Amino acid sequence: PRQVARYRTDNGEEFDVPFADDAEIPGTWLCRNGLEGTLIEGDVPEPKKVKPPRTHWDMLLERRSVEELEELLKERLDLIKAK
Amino acid sequence: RRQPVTVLLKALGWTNEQIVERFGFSEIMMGTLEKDTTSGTDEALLDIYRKLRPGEPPTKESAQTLLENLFFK
Amino acid sequence: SADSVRAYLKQIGKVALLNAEEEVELAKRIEAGLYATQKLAELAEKGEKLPVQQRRDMQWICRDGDRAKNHLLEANLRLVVSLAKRYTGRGMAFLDLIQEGNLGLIRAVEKFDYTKGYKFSTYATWWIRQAITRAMADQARTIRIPVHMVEVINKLGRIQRELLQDLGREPTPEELAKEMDITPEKVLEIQQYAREPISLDQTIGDEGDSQLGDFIEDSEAVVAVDAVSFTLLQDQLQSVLETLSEREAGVVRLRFGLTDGQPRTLDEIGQVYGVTRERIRQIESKTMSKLRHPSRSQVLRDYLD
DNA sequence: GCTTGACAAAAGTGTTAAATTGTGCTATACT
């Protein structure tokens, strides 16, 4: 009483996952390889609610305003022009 | 291991003259100080330093308190 | 060197400690490069490649910024080690405490502000300490406890020690629950969480040669006498059902799921025999009072358990 | 042998509030 689905990890490996036929097949499955993998059937349903990570630039932006950054860069390039 | 028991008496700063004075009748006492190539009291503290604390570059402040802090302290 | 930490201390000692003016210098270069990067990256979207001389110098502003970030870190590595010294012996290896501290140092550099005019060590000490203590809460326990629970376990400890000193004794669950403003039953539940496991590989023989681990029974192991008797019980039921009618036993077997191991509802059994669930309810009660008849039941009595 | 309607307990579902859990952060100076 089982249906088998196949997924493909980003690196090309493929894995067979037996499921119960009455169940709804997930579009991604954590795989024996250790990576996420994508169903080879139609979907591929969803974006999976991505929230981009925090970066050094973000932490710098929330203190220095873009204008302050410009002047400081002006100071830097002008120091470079002098040779 | 590999230590010249004479070299440490130089680590304290005692001059070779006192070695012939105190050693006296000891034959190997005088013969070993002639065999040791260590010259100076602070240079013997260095020959004792690198084998005891291998991997750490020494300093005149560390090399001298090394002996005092190990036992006298 | 001979040790592992003696080796890491050698390489951190090879850098030079900055003074106030240098920290401000590097800080500017770091922010300067970052903005230089975000700006050029903005060009990638809309293109508009820069002039040759303006492109070659922007690539340098960034390279110099990262060289600054790396230099600001390598200069303060001593500060991390100085903080981790005090957190040893608490269940994390010294190097791990150091590495986690370095992680804090990295964020201090990212979030550091040079316009406030404060010495760098002032701000970085916060992150390096939080990085080390936060790390200990996620790691040092074989069975992890979340931060918020590790926060109360510690608090409950100090209360007990402070309460220990004032009472010249250890406080009872009621005194502790009172001083901490919680129910005494909670402080017990908390004190069960703080228990830490033990090594199965310990030698408790004490001129017994044995280790603890080999004294542990296997409770799920198969018991020969039971499985054999259970097989004999399975046969005795097969017989008792033979006395019942073809449909009487058929309903009993589907009712408890003897054949499939899957029990069935009164309605479902009525679907195979083509009747209403009530009719099956009736046939049930009758075959059960038939099984309760002493002739069939007398033999199965010894199987109670 | 059998079915029908009324009926209440038991079992699932969906919706919400409470709780539990994760993460960021703290600016005298401290190497």
Q: Which residues pair with A16 in a beta bridge?
A: A6
Q: Identify from A61, A62, A65, A73 which residue to disrupt to test chain C contact, counting C C-beta atoms within 10 A and taking the largest count.
A: A73
- CB of B44 closer than 8 Å to CB of B70: no
Strand D: list positions under 7 Å from protein Cβ: 2-5, 20-31
- CB of C251 closer than 8 Å to CB of C238: no
d(CA C163, CA C20): 45
d(CA C186, CA A53): 38
Q: Per the CB < 8 Å rule, is C38 touching A57? A: yes
d(CA C26, CA C192): 50
* Cis-peptide, bond into residue A44, ω within 30° of zero: yes
What is the rounded end-to-end Cα distance, in angstroms, of chain C? 68
Phi/psi for C15 (5° steps) reads -95, 175
The tokens for C267 are 């309605």
Describe the crossing of helices C246-256 and C224-243 by its angle, rounded to 10 degrees.
Answer: 140
Token pair 């408790």: residue: C204
Q: Does C10 touch chain B (CB under 8 A)?
A: yes
- CB of B49 closer than 8 Å to CB of B7: no
Residue C92 to chain B, least CA–CA distance (Å): 26
The contacts found for C231-240 with CB under 8 angstroms, 24 or more apart, are C233/C300, C233/C303, C236/C299, C236/C300, C236/C303, C237/C300, C240/C291, C240/C296, C240/C299, C240/C300
The answer, yes or no, to whether A and C have at least 3 beta-carbon pairs within 8 Å is yes
- CB of C73 closer than 8 Å to CB of C105: yes
- CB of C167 closer than 8 Å to CB of C183: no
Provide the 3-class DSSP secondary structure of residue C183.
coil
d(CA A76, CA B23): 72
The reply to whether the CB atom of residue C274 sits less than 7 A from any atom in nucleic acid chain D is yes
Which nucleotide is nearest, taking the CA of residue C279 and each C1'? D2
- Resolution, in Å, please? 3.1
Q: Give chain A's length.
A: 83
d(CA C18, CA C289): 94
Rounded (10°) CA dihedral C2, C5, C11, C12: -160
Alpha helix segments (H runs only) across C91-245: 94-111, 120-139, 147-167, 173-179, 184-193, 224-243
Provide the 3-class DSSP secondary structure of residue A7.
strand
Q: Give chain C's length.
A: 305
Token pair 């990085």: residue: C131
Alpha-carbon distances of C242 from C236, C247, C251, C252, C256, rounded to whole Å = 10, 11, 13, 12, 16
- CA C270 to chain CA centroid, Å, is 49
The tokens for C137 are 């809460």
